[model samples]
Target: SKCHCVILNDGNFIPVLGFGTALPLECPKSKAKELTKIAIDAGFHHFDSASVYNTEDHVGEAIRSKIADGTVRREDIFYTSKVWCTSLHPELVRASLERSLQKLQFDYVDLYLIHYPMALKPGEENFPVDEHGKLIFDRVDLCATWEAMEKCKDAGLTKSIGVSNFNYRQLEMILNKPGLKYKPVCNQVECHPYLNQMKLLDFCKSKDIVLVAYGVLGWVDQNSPVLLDEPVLGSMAKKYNRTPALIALRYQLQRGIVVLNTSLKEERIKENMQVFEFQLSSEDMKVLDGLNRNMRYIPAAIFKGHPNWPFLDEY
Candidate 1:
């Protein structure tokens, strides 16, 4: 009774369930590692991390401890990491991944993502900088970065490669690119009941790309700033006899997307994993779909000029 399924794409399979670790920038390493261990013990075979999470070392330590104790095998787990905006160059790609491996204490990753379709100028520390010192847009050429990602796969650094926070047009460009040895197997995006993204989800399904969802709980206080005062999701939570957060997660899981749920609280983490024990009816899913207002809370507004800002036109 695995609570997850395998998504078949690009001649390989990826787990449909994952534990997201977007731990706060200030979260203690000891706490992060403890929570990750609890998550693995709770049956999460897929673990998601990013260099931005700033806790790769803690994640690596937890996983290594589990492996050492024979709690899990490296092959039995699916580890996913992302390359940040500043590390999109071909030369930096390998170095970036190697750094993640060193932090995670792993030889390779199961999947790697381009974090976002945005690129920053070399040596640019602050983002969204504009002329006259005003904060402007920050977007990247995804095709070029994606090409470098292919090199990672070819070099045995990752088993599969994909994009995060990309739109249909950007994805199409990548799919149509020449000399592509591997098609993007997944598009990890912010999905929830309030912003169900039915059309995008349908497009990913039609293209044979797995849709992996983060921010499924509407918004926790840890990583998302805008969600702090949102009320609509809270209302839905009251209607469903569930927490607004849990309702959001359940909605996406019912829609057949791989869902990532993150929390440092042990009780909450256990509650998040209980979706496999229940089922949402078709009528319920339809009701949830209507809740979509096409909202995107995690808009990386800094990337407005990178040529692949997926939400540039949307906003």
Candidate 2:
């Protein structure tokens, strides 16, 4: 099937190319819902959104609308959401997941993840920063939270449980924990051609874990270099008769990465799906590989001093 589903350790399958549901703040909820329908109409079966992204309602709304319109069924869509930081404590894990479900208007999310390793004091907001403007980080152990996540799966609140933005050492903590019920099936990270995360990808492969690549082309920061501006990407884009963004996404797909295709414009949403139509050659893949600058776009600058800042380690 051109659908390209990746089987996980927990027996769940994730589609290779998914529609990422995060967008800019001006009118994202309404805009997100509109674009989601367009993406689904364009043949995107898998959808990704986070609690922090504030697009869960629209993502679920799109899935529900599709089911009603006979375009797809709820079971046919793979919906992923994350646990926000304010509710990362062991006792609050289930509550956060439940709140996400409530917002999503669903019985259970296909996948639920701890959005970040750093936790904040239990509250209503996702980011709990103090008067000084730095994040007020809570010292809750992630392993304890992992135990709670295991319970969520056991209790059937989430179909599969995992972590995001976690480094290798942080992952090892849960993998080696005593009485660990379920091994993490995937680790989502900010990976583009610039911050390719080669070592982390290799480590995940060695552990029978699937690495999900977020920030596929790049994050929306004006300061960061446009991934489409890379000369090699431009050259390959010309050769493949595809946009540089599509070339960047195809590069990740060739590496067995689950790539996210995000957009606000309807034409771009439709265009992003064309990656499955053409295949990139091995030579071109290597050429893209040489563009890695170890650059990161979404480095958690606020959590820099937190013990679990995943980027500190080389891997």
Candidate 3:
């Protein structure tokens, strides 16, 4: 377990390899149970989900089933959930967390994150917009938002707290906020060889913040890089006698970035866990680093005009 972990600044360790649970809104409710259980059977203990993902209930159910069968104790798994855009308000943060808890069937998550830097006005359902048909992006005093996140940690609702999709400047806002309790434990972002996030990763290291890399493979659409088809990944796969996808996953792990991998097939789930069985050489790592295209699949284009949009910085 120790060998598979990336220690967070808060003294907790997250399994370096995480399984993402952001299924398509069109995904069958049953897919979650099958995929999640396959992942655990394939030896995954770290699970990542978000309020917007709508898969929390499925994840919680699968883990609970495993626990009932004595496969793993409650503490053996590291669960991560997030506060969605509508709940970024200091007042709404806890409610968002509570809703997630109710769905996840867990008292506390190992880590919780601000799903995005922007906030949305709440609707009865998720991602509703204004009467004008434009997306509603609410602005929050970020320090106040961080304060509420801090309270969640203090209340023992979440063991650690962090933000996602935050740029360097936004992270600095929290680091330098007038009265910050716990600094963000990690920043989850869309990171792959094409969008390596080297600058952000280095800055996080300097600040003792862990860089959690989601989309290390790619997204569901063609908007993302295709790891299996990339020439750099293929060549390295040959050198290491591994699949290109495994090469992509192992690259981030070797770089100390926590990686989130998602797949629906049992074979892929089993195959992904094999990343830890091999190593990438130093020269091979440099070869992969040069393939960075800075391509971002999750551009968050809907909230572009919001004041707190966090993607404007170079890092």
Candidate 4:
């Protein structure tokens, strides 16, 4: 089951399945290097991380080690890094990407994303908060930030530029911006059976933007039931003789949405690759579609008061 690559709107290709290098469940942050090495060995070619998540150094080290060992070349690996919300200003975009490149030790990332639509007061703090416990927001226009993102692509710091957690209106703003140089290649967001993002996916497809999905396995809320615990997925896994997570991952791939999966355990990392081996029947895929409950695991509700909060839109 070899993971396949899908062509982006910009003509660059991204692996359909990406390895997310966020904090692992139990492993310390430094363990990201080891986990990344394991994932690479397991055949994951896409690595997704963000400036807000400080695992870039470890992920970069693991990538370098793999290349040094002749296990994989840099070109075979599609590394993605995101510019965080605090650095969304047009002037600060390139600086943020340069900082990530310094940490990644890579000449350029394959895909660079605007981490979020909301702009925060740019400063030393990742999340600048007022003494009143509110986020100090910024008024930078998204189109201006996008202009800088195009500059990053032109400067050869990133091969392609896209966004994360943006609603349709925000995407349309950039798409219809005057003197648009490059259209977004993808939109990374939390998506799974619980939150299929059908409307958003449809809109992105219409505009030739790929929909990269995170939180495919389930939400992080321990108090609530997770996606893997659903009887439908369990039953389908039993029918396919596979894990529920595989069924979940396959569901997204079949729909042409890129999926991100993260695990620290070596065997689980390898097991996730099985997603590419199986195919789901149309009935089973429809059944999974019925499981959608409009659930958003990472609502990022703390920033709800911000003027650019994206969740308010239906898409």
Ranking by lDDT: 4, 3, 2, 1
RMSD in Å for model 2: 2.0
Worst 10 residues of 3 by lDDT: 218-227
lDDT of 2 by residue, 1-315 (tens): 236799989998888889888887787477788888998999888888888888888888878899899998877788888888888889998988888899889999888888888888778876777898888888887889999999999988888988899999999998999998899989999998898999999999999888999888875577566777888889888987899999999999899999887888889989977888899988888878888998888898888988778888987
lDDT of 4 by residue, 1-315 (tens): 233988998989899999999995466778889999999988899999998888999999999999999999999999999988899888898998999999989999999999899889887788899898888988988899999999999999999999999999999999999999999999999999999999999999999999999998885557677679899999999999999999999999999999999886899999987987889999999999999999898889989998888999899
- The sequence of per-residue lDDT tens digits that candidate 3 reaches over residues 37-141 is 888888899999888888899999999999999887788899999998888889899998998899888999999999888888884466767787677777788
Best by TM-score: 4
Report the Cα lDDT for residue 132, model 2: 87
Global CA lDDT computed for model 4: 0.91
Residue 179's lDDT in candidate 4: 100
- Between prediction 2 and prediction 4, the one with superior lDDT is 4
Worst 10 residues of 4 by lDDT: 218-227
- For candidate 3, the per-residue lDDT at 60 reads 93
Name the best candidate (by lDDT). Answer: 4
Clashing pairs in 1: 119-140, 137-304, 138-302, 138-303, 138-304, 139-303, 139-306, 140-306
Per-candidate clashes come to: 8, 0, 0, 0
